[PDB]
Structure of Aryl hydrocarbon receptor-interacting protein-like 1 (AIPL1):
Amino acid sequence: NVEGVKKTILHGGTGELPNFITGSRVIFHFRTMKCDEERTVIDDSRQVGQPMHIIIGNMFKLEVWEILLTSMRVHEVAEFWCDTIHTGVYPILSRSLRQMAQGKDPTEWHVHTCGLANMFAYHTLGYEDLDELQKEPQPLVFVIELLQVDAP
Ligand code: NA
């Protein structure tokens, strides 16, 4: 448990806690929503396509999304409300997922240059919804569905 984050389980997982060691790969679906009346969806892995797949970089120093994932069991579906303090990073993080969904490598030099240039010129991440999210810091809910943990 971390401050500013409420976990709710909507479908209980199966089995013992996955082995969430350094280098293991987590396959999951997720949906991100505002906390407005409509619960406006910001991103939805199922809608766009295939599930996300991340590698735990270091079990001893977890990324924020790893803090979420490593609390989960296979097949679990949980909703995590995260206060404004945890979510200011989400728009750039979504930016980068969205470009990888496309054919673009956000780490390639021409892509990253264009991003910084448009961001300085136009104060934009390339996406109206993420821009409005960054201009208005606020809570988000992430619903995550954990599908599979693979050993390294
Ligand atoms: Na399901």
The chain has one domain: 1-152. Helices lie at 45-48, 64-69, 84-87, 90-101, 109-122, 128-135. Residues 145 surround sodium ion (CB under 6 Å).
